[PDB]
Write a protein that binds this ligand. Structure first.
Ligand code: CLA
Ligand code: CLA
Ligand code: CLA
Ligand code: CLA
Ligand code: CLA
Ligand code: CLA
Ligand code: CLA
Ligand code: CLA
Ligand code: CLA
Ligand SMILES: CC1=CCCC(C)(C)[C@H]1/C=C/C(C)=C/C=C/C(C)=C/C=C/C=C(C)/C=C/C=C(C)/C=C/C1=C(C)CCCC1(C)C
Ligand code: SF4
Lengths: 60, 80, 147, 139, 161, 74, 742
């Protein structure tokens, strides 16, 4: 993906699994979960952002 | 004792380690997150099972997971 | 009166089914505990985080449906017994008129039929219904201690 | 390193909240810290005590009681000089916290990671797969 | 008649219901003087009670052995005014409320602060929506067939299982 | 006649709860989703929110109006 | 003059802007909702001022103006009580026949058949019978006409407008500074002397010049419109000297200290007026005059601006002995810097006074014709027992909020608080033992009796007939009070109350008061009371003493006053907060006050209330069944709950059908509460998920994401509906029962 794009989450235990977020940053370093995605819904913990990997994220 | 696990989704925020009332958790060096550090559970015999670490954790599903197990004098928090 | 109680019994069958089906289908996971299957069938909670997780286990839906099972068999057996005791007297019209509102169930079934039971002993003597009169109070005591 | 048993104790008038027979037959915990002042603090087990200027020493029944005091002593009196010990009735004194001289929330070399699972939490094994098998659910 | 019931206009038990209801009011009226406010209040209640019993008798309702009206709800047209037409009236209002509430929640999603529109309602826009509800059956079905009522299963968050 | 009816309906309600409880114990403990790919069992779990919300509607539907008529009558 | 008035002028701007911004008062809530929890958190924390602001000055200002708002509501409430008496009541008909007409000041509209509630209360009137005792107050006041009730209604409305103006004015225009609120000596001097002292003195003046002449003419038998207006007693001193000849001498006997001249209207009679069954109003006038003097005297104790007076700090710091360390040192600083510590004391005392009011008003009936109005006697006893029990539990609620928040160990070293917290295990273990002993030896006596009566062994029961547990100490105290007139209260003519012994006072052939004998059943239920009060103290004291820390949670003060738990570890710490002991102690308060009002209701019907006829014998409402049937639980179930629930169940189709509906409705609310009490939040959030899914399917999900209620709010909602349901059931049962038979 690229920064600022809209993505549909594919991590089955995510709060936002099959919901749309927007990509904040992507880390070039060897990070296991380099895609930073922000959402408009908060999770049950009140967090509105999470890190993801490329194989857990699809552009819409 | 209780079983406390740290999954590789840990962003190294150290919040679980600061919230732990029994010094169960500490930070060890890593290279899988930007912070360069991951939570660790070297002293789970002292874990009382409060799950204050899980409350502190900000990853979408908890990087730190407490699994309540056999009860002891330490994990039952008995001063008697 | 029979129409109304059957729809109450239908309400209680679908609501008991709801708690139990929700317990069976959310047993493996939910959105609060997506890894609920790692913890077993009967665990207390996942702690106060994520808003609070009291009664989140699949066992706890057994626990909650047990109250609804007791409520439904109450509605079934209250109906069976009142419909039969009024017929056995020869006064089926007492059920026919009083079952359509809830005060008819309270006064013409529970309050009216209580009197031989609660007079099994009194300051004037006792009879052989004294044991059921004692089990009656005994049952109210165990029930309240559960609270 | 070892607990100097002779360190004076904070002026306290006693309480019923202190340790019971399990401390003298199973284990006891101690906390030491340096105070720049002769000031009142709150005991985890009850009322208020006064820590003496210099080195203080307490005995508590639970490890959490020593750390709850350590949290308070560092948040209101900015004492970061606290060392927590475990004491067995055999006389053995076991240093506890901070375990390697550095606080746990700060990284340190030579710390080996315990409990770390290489996958995310959703990648565990289903219970049916490991039934009548010793294999662990973490992959 | 239907299910062994009797039309309320010829039920003798319905007739005794009306009489007992009026005797109960007349004995309360026997304790007041003619022009008093308690006498006028009870005389108006005897008029209301008689009117209700007269209307029920002439309406085609069926009475039981207990002398009370019974409702037939199996779908027959001679009895559609007891459930089917009140039900048709209900569903029109209920779908109206549902269509109007749904239209406002979709509007509020496109707002500057979507959750402020739900605790502080934009009353001119929310009144624009309430007026639209009169043709909800046509508006909602066209919404359905145009692929805008139902979202596909793969844009809905579900539990891992 | 009264005791026998009451006895066996209470036995029935306990047995019915236990079946659903042990169905819950089955899914947690004994159900393997990979030996059940696209079964009737797996497809149940695939639309569990459809099942649970429609029980929720029918319970509320029955409850609002059954209690509502009774309160109206009272 | 260090006691001075200091005010900030125009502090806060009168703007509608913050009205449009719900949640403006806290930093968390002011950024808007994202889940439905925000909506509940908005109402939960709104009057928690010391949770929004750091400064004690702004907190004190919000409290002072909110107390004016409360006063405005009470005055509006009082004004409406007078207006309904003036406009929609049978008051004037009741004045002619107090023993025949039933008070009624509420008339319903005819809408859905609900006009059946306008029952025949008497006096050519239809309405809802009222039991608040206003009619008896108004006759005691000397109102005698609806015209004067309209003027009282306007007087309440003018006061209601003035209080809401003052609350606005003192928050927005002229707000006092913290040094104004921190004048405890000045406030006590004025509230003893000015509020309570001039309150009693002025009311004594109304009683002497208006209540005494008007009520003497009424009890002589003069018709209400035949009675001179209250100012003609003020001017025509000859007319006042007809009724009370001491007025011929005026105020010379007062000033020259020849007070015995005033014995016409300042009596010490005791007992009841035979005509009305109420207290002699000449006694109440002397009571209020004497109370007024020593409230004005008491309000000169403390030092303000001239060197005379006590320093309250000096009094407290001097009271210290060898057991109690530094003593009461530091308590002045607590009570002039913590509003919660002040509210904890004042709620516990106000609750205690409300419980005392319930006992004193049934036993020494103060108003004319209130003793034989049994619906009022039962209503105001039951109402003031509940107000007392609720206010007592809020005293421990705010003692906990003080300890968690306003308590500072540095300023409380070795004083009485420090010492209480440092032996709280000894307090809670000894109270715990007393409650086990009390429960076994009060309720177990009932269980012994249930079993023996069921087993056919009536000789083995604790009864007046069998083994006797007599209350000799209560019987002895009753003996002393009957002997007191002429002996240890020599100038009294009658006893303080006929409940202690003496005559039967009958008004309109109904018993006003008569000796309330104490037997084994009275011994048993009094120890039932001591058990339920001690357990309530146990739950609430344990919450206050362990609010900051336990052996379980060493840092409970960091979690706050109100937290649901500290996790499932340590075996489980569910309901470990100080809030959760108030939650558990309101159930045991409910249990306690329910037995008190049941004891009162059954005893008064069985042994006191009823009808007198020839041979002077009294036929009581339930015929004296208390002695031999209140000793078993089956007796309370059968002869009290079952026997007396007949009126509320058979009430349909009458004017009491409203009580029949509220009986069922409250049974519903009570049961519905158990959904919230026995369940947990985790079930309800997962159920909401499937409901959210069906909304997502139809694209109608809300932007304020629905949540299950918090763990605490589930406890608060469960307790509130339990109390609403439990108390509402008894309210209908009490009111339909006593209106029908009493
Ligand atoms: C404070 C206590 C109190 C109480 C409990 C009552 C209770 C009652 N009064 Mg009494 N009354 C009172 C004070 C009180 N009154 C006072 C002080 C006066 C003198 C002005 C009166 C004068 C009075 C008269 C003259 C009458 C009553 C009547 C009634 C009855 C029906 C009222 C009704 O449905 O009107 C409802 C009227 C409406 C206009 C409905 C308004 C509903 C709105 C929506 C409430 C909303 C409040 C609002 C949202 C608050 C927020 C403000 C906003 C800016 C957000 C009821 C028994 C009637 C009666 O007994 O008839 C036999 C009657 O005729 N009252
Ligand atoms: C003689 C002096 C005096 C009197 C009567 C009062 C009376 C009162 N004060 Mg106090 N107060 C005083 C001096 C006085 N104060 C001083 C000197 C201070 C500064 C240290 C305070 C500081 C203070 C605080 C901080 C608070 C009060 C509160 C209250 C009210 C308590 C609630 C209550 O019972 O009201 C109901 C009883 C009544 C009798 C209602 C009466 C209403 C008016 C104001 C009473 C006086 C009217 C007037 C003097 C009488 C004229 C008589 C004329 C017809 C001949 C009450 C009105 C509390 C309150 O509720 O705030 C509003 C509160 O929070 N006062
Ligand atoms: C429990 C199942 C059940 C169901 C689903 C129905 C459904 C229906 N019944 Mg009922 N019925 C039932 C059992 C049932 N019935 C039983 C057990 C009896 C006793 C024998 C009856 C006796 C009965 C009678 C006597 C009649 C119905 C009619 C009807 C139909 C009228 C509704 C309508 O507007 O459609 C038709 C209209 C439209 C589609 C558009 C109208 C605008 C409807 C299909 C009526 C009917 O029309 O029969 C087909 C009719 O006359 N029913
Ligand atoms: C108008 C808005 C709206 C719409 C279209 C729906 C639509 C639906 N809801 Mg409901 N719901 C709503 C509001 C709404 N909901 C609110 C406010 C709540 C909180 C009480 C709920 C609570 C709720 C539950 C608990 C359940 C549903 C269910 C359902 C489904 C079946 C219909 C039903 O059972 O109704 C039931 C409706 C209620 C129980 C409450 C409705 C209360 C009012 C009447 C609606 C709100 C009016 C709103 C203020 C509109 C203002 C518009 C204005 C600003 C222009 C359907 C998806 C059920 C489901 O999932 O089954 C498949 C189900 O179990 N909903
Ligand atoms: C009398 C007691 C009572 C009542 C009424 C309920 C009612 C309900 N329960 Mg609960 N429950 C109870 C006891 C009770 N329960 C107990 C003791 C337990 C054991 C802990 C449970 C455990 C339990 C579980 C575990 C579940 C339920 C469910 C349900 C629902 C099933 C019936 C239904 O779906 O529609 C009936 C609907 C109603 C009865 C609502 C009444 C309509 C209200 C009163 C409208 C009135 C509005 C009025 C103006 C409000 C005035 C407020 C005032 C301040 C102005 C319903 C909300 C299930 C559920 O939520 O599924 C959807 C569910 O999963 N209950
Ligand atoms: C929610 C609160 C609440 C409500 C709705 C009521 C409602 C009622 N009360 Mg109760 N009351 C309450 C709380 C409440 N009370 C508390 C907390 C107390 C303890 C102080 C009392 C003490 C009380 C008494 C002593 C009397 C009532 C009476 C009444 C009734 C007539 C109302 C009236 O005009 O008062 C009229 C009140 C009077 C005419 C006399 C009041 C005399 C007291 C001593 C004045 C004290 C004022 C002072 C500022 C308070 C100081 C408190 C102290 C701790 C320092 C009505 C049923 C009267 C009643 O039952 O009549 C049938 C009655 O005589 N109340
Ligand atoms: C705040 C309460 C209050 C108020 C405003 C009043 C007001 C009054 N009283 Mg009352 N009075 C009160 C309390 C009160 N009293 C109390 C507590 C007592 C008991 C000691 C009395 C006993 C009393 C008597 C015995 C008399 C008054 C009289 C008067 C009037 C004074 C006339 C005068 O100076 O000549 C007084 C006459 C002289 C020779 C001097 C005046 C209306 C006099 C009056 O006018 O009677 C109606 C009168 O004779 N008062
Ligand atoms: C003079 C009396 C007084 C005062 C000033 C206060 C003031 C306060 N209390 Mg205390 N309290 C009191 C009496 C008092 N309380 C009593 C008598 C009790 C015993 C029940 C308590 C128990 C108590 C607890 C347990 C707590 C407080 C808290 C608070 C604070 C927050 C208030 C708030 O935001 O609530 C907002 C108000 C509401 C949400 C109102 C809803 C409450 C009920 C459910 C509605 C009322 C039902 C109604 C009467 C009947 C309905 C009729 C029905 C048929 C429809 C505030 C400092 C809280 C706190 O954190 O303080 C720091 C807290 O946790 N209080
Ligand atoms: C009927 C219901 C019931 C009963 C019996 C109890 C019983 C008790 N509660 Mg509980 N409680 C209840 C409902 C009940 N509660 C509810 C609904 C709540 C909800 C809020 C609570 C909340 C609560 C709290 C928060 C507290 C209690 C406390 C207590 C104890 C009071 C001390 C006492 O009386 O010891 C005596 C014991 C009894 C009276 C129990 C009955 C025993 C009788 C005499 C017969 C004994 C028969 C004998 C043992 C037979 C032996 C042979 C047999 C084994 C074969 C006691 C264990 C308090 C406590 O534990 O402190 C001491 C306390 O702090 N309760
Ligand atoms: C939770 C759970 C998880 C997974 C595993 C699990 C254990 C399987 C599960 C549990 C599931 C559970 C507990 C499931 C419980 C399932 C139950 C109780 C099913 C009831 C079935 C009854 C039927 C089909 C009656 C049919 C009658 C008919 C057709 C009569 C017809 C007629 C005749 C012949 C005569 C009259 C005329 C008519 C009316 C025409
Ligand atoms: S209150 Fe609920 S979340 Fe907290 S420990 Fe108890 S069960 Fe778990």
């Amino acid at each position: 993906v690229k920064r600022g794009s809209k993505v549909r989450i594919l991590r089955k235990e995510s709060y936002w699994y099959q919901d749309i977020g927007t990509v904040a940053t992507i880390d070039t370093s060897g990070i296991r979960y380099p895609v930073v995605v922000r959402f408009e819904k908060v999770s049950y913990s009140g967090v509105n952002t999470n890190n993801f990997s490329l194989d857990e994220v699809v552009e819409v | 004792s209780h079983s406390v696990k740290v999954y590789d989704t840990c962003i190294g925020c150290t919040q679980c380690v600061r919230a732990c009332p029994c010094d169960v958790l500490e930070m060890v060096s890593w290279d899988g997150c930007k912070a360069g550090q991951i939570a660790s559970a070297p002293r789970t015999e002292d874990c009382i099972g409060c799950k204050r670490c899980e409350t502190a954790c900000p990853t979408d599903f908890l990087s730190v997971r407490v699994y309540l197990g056999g009860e002891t004098t330490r994990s039952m928090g008995l001063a008697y | 009166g029979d129409f109304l109680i059957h729809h109450a019994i239908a309400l209680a069958l679908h609501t008991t089914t709801l708690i139990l089906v929700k317990g069976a289908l959310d047993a493996r996971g939910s959105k609060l505990m997506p890894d609920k299957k790692d913890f077993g069938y009967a665990f207390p909670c996942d702690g106060p985080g994520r808003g609070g997780t009291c009664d989140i286990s699949a066992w706890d839906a057994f626990y909650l449906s047990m109250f609804w099972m007791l409520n439904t068999i109450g509605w079934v057996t209250f109906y069976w017994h009142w419909k039969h005791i009024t017929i056995w007297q020869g006064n089926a019209g007492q059920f026919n008129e009083s079952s359509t509102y809830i005060m008819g169930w309270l006064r013409d079934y529970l309050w009216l039929n209580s009197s031989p039971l609660i007079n099994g002993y009194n300051p004037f003597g006792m009879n052989s219904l004294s044991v059921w009169s004692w089990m009656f109070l005994f049952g109210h005591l165990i029930w309240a201690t559960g609270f | 390193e070892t607990l100097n048993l002779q360190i004076p104790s904070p002026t306290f008038e006693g309480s019923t909240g202190g340790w019971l027979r399990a401390a003298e037959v199973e284990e006891k915990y101690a906390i030491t810290w340096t105070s720049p002042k002769e000031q009142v603090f709150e005991m985890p087990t009850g009322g208020a005590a006064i820590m003496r200027q210099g080195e203080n020493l307490l005995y508590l029944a639970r490890k959490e009681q020593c750390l709850a005091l350590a949290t308070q002593v560092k948040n209101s009196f900015k004492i970061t000089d606290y060392k927590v010990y475990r004491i067995f009735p055999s006389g053995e004194v076991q240093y506890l916290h901070p375990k390697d001289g550095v606080f746990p929330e700060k990284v340190n070399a030579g710390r080996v990671g315990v409990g770390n699972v290489s996958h995310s939490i959703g990648k565990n094994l289903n219970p049916a797969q490991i039934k009548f098998t010793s294999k662990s659910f973490n992959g | 008649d239907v299910a062994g019931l009797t039309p309320c206009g010829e039920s003798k038990e319905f007739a005794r219901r009306l009489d007992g209801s009026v005797k109960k009011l007349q004995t309360r009226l026997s304790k007041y003087e003619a022009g008093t406010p308690p006498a006028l209040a009870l005389q108006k209640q005897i008029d209301k009670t008689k009117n209700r019993f007269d209307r029920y008798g002439k309406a085609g309702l069926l009475c039981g052995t207990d002398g009370l009206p019974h409702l037939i709800t199996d779908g027959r047209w001679t009895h559609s005014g007891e459930f089917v037409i009140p039900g048709l009236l209900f569903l029109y209002v209920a779908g109206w409320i549902g269509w109007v509430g749904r239209s406002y929640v979709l509007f509020a999603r496109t707002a500057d602060k979507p959750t402020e529109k739900e605790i502080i309602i934009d009353v001119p826009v929310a009144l624009s929506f309430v007026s639209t509800g009169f043709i909800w059956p046509f508006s909602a079905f066209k919404e359905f067939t145009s692929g805008n009522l139902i979202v596909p299963a793969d844009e809905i968050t579900v539990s891992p299982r | 006649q009264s005791a026998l009816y009451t006895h066996h309906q209470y036995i029935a309600g306990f047995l019915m709860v236990g079946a659903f409880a042990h169905g819950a114990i089955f899914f947690v403990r004994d159900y393997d989703p990979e030996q059940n790919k696209n079964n009737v069992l797996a497809r149940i779990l695939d639309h569990k929110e459809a099942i649970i919300s429609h029980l929720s509607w029918v319970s509320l539907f029955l409850g609002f109006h059954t209690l509502g008529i009774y309160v109206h009558n009272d | 003059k260090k006691v001075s008035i200091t005010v900030d002028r125009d502090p806060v701007a009168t703007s509608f802007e913050k009205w449009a911004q719900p949640g403006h008062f806290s930093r968390t809530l002011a950024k808007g909702p994202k889940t439905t929890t925000w909506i509940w958190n908005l109402h939960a924390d709104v009057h928690d001022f010391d949770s929004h602001t750091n400064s004690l000055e702004d907190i004190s200002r919000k409290i002072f103006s909110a107390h004016f708002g409360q006063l405005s509501i009470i005055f509006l409430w009082l004004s409406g009580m007078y207006f309904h008496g003036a406009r929609f009541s049978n008051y004037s008909a009741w004045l002619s026949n107090p023993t025949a007409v039933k008070p009624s000041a509420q008339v319903v509209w005819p809408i859905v058949g609900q006009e059946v509630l306008n029952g025949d209360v008497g006096g050519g009137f239809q309405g809802v019978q009222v039991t608040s005792g206003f009619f008896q107050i108004w006759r005691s006041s000397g109102i005698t006409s609806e015209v004067e009730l309209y003027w009282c209604a306007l007087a309440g409305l003018i006061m209601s407008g003035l209080m809401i103006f003052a609350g606005w004015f003192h928050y927005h225009k002229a707000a006092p500074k913290l040094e104004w609120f921190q004048n405890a000596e000045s406030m006590l001097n004025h509230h003893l002397s000015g509020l309570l002292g001039l309150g009693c003195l002025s009311w004594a003046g109304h009683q002497i010049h208006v209540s005494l002449p008007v009520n003497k003419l009424l009890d002589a038998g003069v018709a209400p419109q035949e009675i001179p207006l209250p100012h003609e007693f003020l001017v025509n001193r000859d007319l006042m000297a007809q009724l009370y000849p001491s007025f011929s001498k005026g105020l010379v006997p007062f000033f020259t200290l020849n007070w015995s001249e005033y014995s016409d209207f300042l009596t010490f009679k005791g007992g009841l007026n035979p005509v009305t069954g109420g207290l002699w109003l000449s006694d109440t006038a002397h009571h209020h005059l004497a109370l007024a003097v020593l409230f004005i005297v008491a309000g000169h104790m403390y030092r303000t601006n001239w060197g005379i007076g006590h320093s309250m700090k000096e009094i407290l710091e001097a009271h210290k002995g060898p057991f109690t360390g530094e003593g009461h040192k530091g308590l002045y600083e607590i009570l002039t810097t913590s509003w919660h510590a002040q509210l904890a004391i004042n709620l516990a005392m106000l609750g205690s006074v409300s419980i005392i009011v319930a006992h004193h008003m049934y036993a020494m009936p103060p108003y004319p014709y209130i003793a034989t109005d049994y619906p009022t006697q039962l209503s105001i006893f039951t109402h003031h027992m509940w107000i007392g029990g609720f206010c007592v539990c809020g005293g421990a609620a705010h003692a906990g909020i003080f300890m968690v928040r306003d308590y500072n160990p540095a300023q409380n070293y070795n004083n009485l608080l420090d010492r209480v917290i440092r032996h709280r295990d000894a307090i809670i273990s000894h109270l715990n033992w007393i409650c086990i002993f009390l429960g076994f030896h009060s309720f177990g006596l009932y269980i012994h009796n249930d079993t023996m009566r069921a087993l056919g062994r009536t000789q083995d029961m604790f009864s007046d007939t069998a083994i006797q547990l007599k209350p000799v100490f209560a019987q002895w105290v009753q003996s002393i009070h009957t002997l007191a007139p002429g002996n240890t209260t020599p100038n009294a003519l009658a006893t303080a109350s006929y409940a202690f012994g003496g005559d039967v006072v009958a008004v309109g052939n109904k018993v006003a008061m008569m000796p309330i004998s104490l037997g084994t059943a009275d011994f048993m239920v009094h120890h039932i009371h001591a058990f339920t009060i001690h357990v309530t103290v146990l739950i609430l004291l344990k919450g206050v003493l362990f609010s900051r820390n336990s052996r379980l949670i060493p840092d409970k003060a960091n979690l706050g006053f109100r937290f649901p738990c500290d996790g499932p570890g340590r075996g489980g710490t569910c309901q470990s907060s100080a809030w959760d002991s108030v939650f558990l102690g309101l159930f045991w308060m409910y249990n306690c006050i329910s037995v008190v009002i049941f004891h009162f209701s059954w005893k008064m019907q069985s042994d006191v209330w009823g009808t007198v006829q020839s041979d002077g014998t009294v036929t009581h409402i339930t015929g004296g069944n208390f002695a031999q049937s209140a000793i078993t639980i089956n007796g309370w179930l059968r002869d009290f709950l079952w026997a007396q629930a007949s009126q509320v169940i058979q009430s349909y189709g009458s004017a009491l059908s409203a009580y029949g509906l509220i009986f069922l409705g409250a049974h519903f609310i009570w049961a519905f509460s158990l959904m919230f009490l026995f369940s947990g939040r985790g079930y309800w959030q997962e159920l909401i998920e499937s409901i959210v899914w069906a909304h997502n399917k139809l694209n109608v999900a809300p932007a304020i994401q629905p949540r299950a209620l918090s763990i605490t709010q589930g406890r608060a909602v469960g307790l509130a509906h339990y109390l609403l349901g439990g108390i509402g059931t008894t309210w209908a049962f009490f009111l339909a029962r006593i209106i029908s038979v009493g």
